[PDB]
Nucleic acid binder design. Structure first.
Ligand SMILES: [Zn+2]
Ligand SMILES: [Zn+2]
Ligand SMILES: [Zn+2]
Ligand SMILES: [Zn+2]
Lengths: 70, 70
DNA sequence: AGGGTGAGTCAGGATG
DNA sequence: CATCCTGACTCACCCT
């Protein structure tokens, strides 16, 4: 069972998609919050257990593309 | 520790009252749907883990008497 | 990051 | 067969 966003240990199927606890709370905070997410690279960053902190923009984009939805 | 409605092991404070999980959802289904239950005894049926299924009418009365409420 | 509680779903048993 | 009632499982939100 791996998080379809960051490949960390999946806890269940949250907001329609198999994901870990951190990606669950990240996504909800991203949808509802006011954030200024901008990628410092090419909108194609590697998202894994460590790197996921680096680019919220690409993390959020991957959540959306994997089909996450409130 | 014990459900105030059927004396089974309580799982938490549900709808205002210390109850087991099954009495929790029993009550929720009784207050939203119809609760036109008939007791086949004398309205004092024994409600315990083994017998709580026999008399929804007496089970529902014990939920109300214990103070359960949405 | 995790406990507490509400709510949806599913399957199984009893019933018709 | 189908329908109804039950309770365990899973996930939601809220607060710490
Ligand atoms: Zn993740
Ligand atoms: Zn990026
Ligand atoms: Zn109970
Ligand atoms: Zn009764």
């Amino acid at each position: 069972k791996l998080c379809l966003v960051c490949s960390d240990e999946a806890s269940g199927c949250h907001y329609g998609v198999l994901t870990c606890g951190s990606c669950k709370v990240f996504f909800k905070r991203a949808v509802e919050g006011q954030h200024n997410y901008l990628c410092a690279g090419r909108n194609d960053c590697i998202i894994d257990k460590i790197r996921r902190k680096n680019c919220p923009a690409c993390r959020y984009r991957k959540c959306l593309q994997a089909g996450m939805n409130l």
